[PDB]
């Protein structure tokens, strides 16, 4: 969280910014990737148009590298078709 | 002297397809590298070396 705080001081964080419920999920991360993660949510910040860095975009870079780590790389619209692909029985089975 | 330093060479993004994502982060890439200062102004800065 220190760390956090020290490599994210020069830049314009919001509000409901908080590192504190996503220790869990930087577990054996070092330094260089929590700046790397804070420039990854800088950028994922900026393309979308966006101001400030809320924690949805932290949130979505360490879900897009944990997608990444299997070696799964969809946009959104490739990804909604090939979901609307797989039938619905087969599916279900999956949910349950 | 045999590094071709080159400036055009006739091959575009559309040429190349199917791996949108890719293409879409190599764009930011070169973006960033292009238009250093505005996003340094928000403390970005580009990976040095892109295997």
Same mark, same amino acid.
């Given at each position: 969280?220190?760390?956090?705080?020290?490599?994210?001081?020069?830049?314009?964080?919001?509000?409901?910014?908080?590192?504190?419920?996503?220790?869990?999920?930087?577990?054996?991360?070092?330094?260089?990737?929590?700046?790397?993660?804070?420039?990854?949510?800088?950028?994922?910040?900026?393309?979308?148009?966006?101001?400030?860095?809320?924690?949805?975009?932290?949130?979505?870079?360490?879900?897009?590298?944990?997608?990444?780590?299997?070696?799964?790389?969809?946009?959104?619209?490739?990804?909604?078709?090939?979901?609307?692909?797989?039938?619905?029985?087969?599916?279900?089975?999956?949910?349950? | *002297?045999?590094?071709?330093?080159?400036? *055009?060479?006739?091959?575009?993004?559309?040429?190349?397809?199917?791996?949108?994502?890719?293409?879409?982060?190599?764009?930011?890439?070169?973006?960033?590298? *292009?238009?250093?200062?505005?996003?340094?102004?928000?403390?970005?800065?580009?990976?040095?070396?892109?295997?």
């Amino acid at each position: 969280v220190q760390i956090f705080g020290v490599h994210s001081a020069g830049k314009n964080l919001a509000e409901d910014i908080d590192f504190g419920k996503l220790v869990f999920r930087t577990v054996g991360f070092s330094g260089a990737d929590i700046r790397n993660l804070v420039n990854e949510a800088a950028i994922m910040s900026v393309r979308k148009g966006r101001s400030y860095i809320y924690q949805q975009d932290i949130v979505d870079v360490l879900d897009k590298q944990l997608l990444e780590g299997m070696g799964v790389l969809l946009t959104e619209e490739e990804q909604q078709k090939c979901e609307q692909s797989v039938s619905y029985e087969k599916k279900r089975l999956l949910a349950v | *002297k045999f590094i071709s330093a080159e400036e *055009k060479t006739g091959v575009t993004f559309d040429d190349f397809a199917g791996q949108e994502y890719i293409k879409r982060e190599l764009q930011e890439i070169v973006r960033i590298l *292009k238009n250093d200062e505005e996003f340094q102004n928000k403390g970005i800065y580009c990976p040095k070396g892109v295997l």
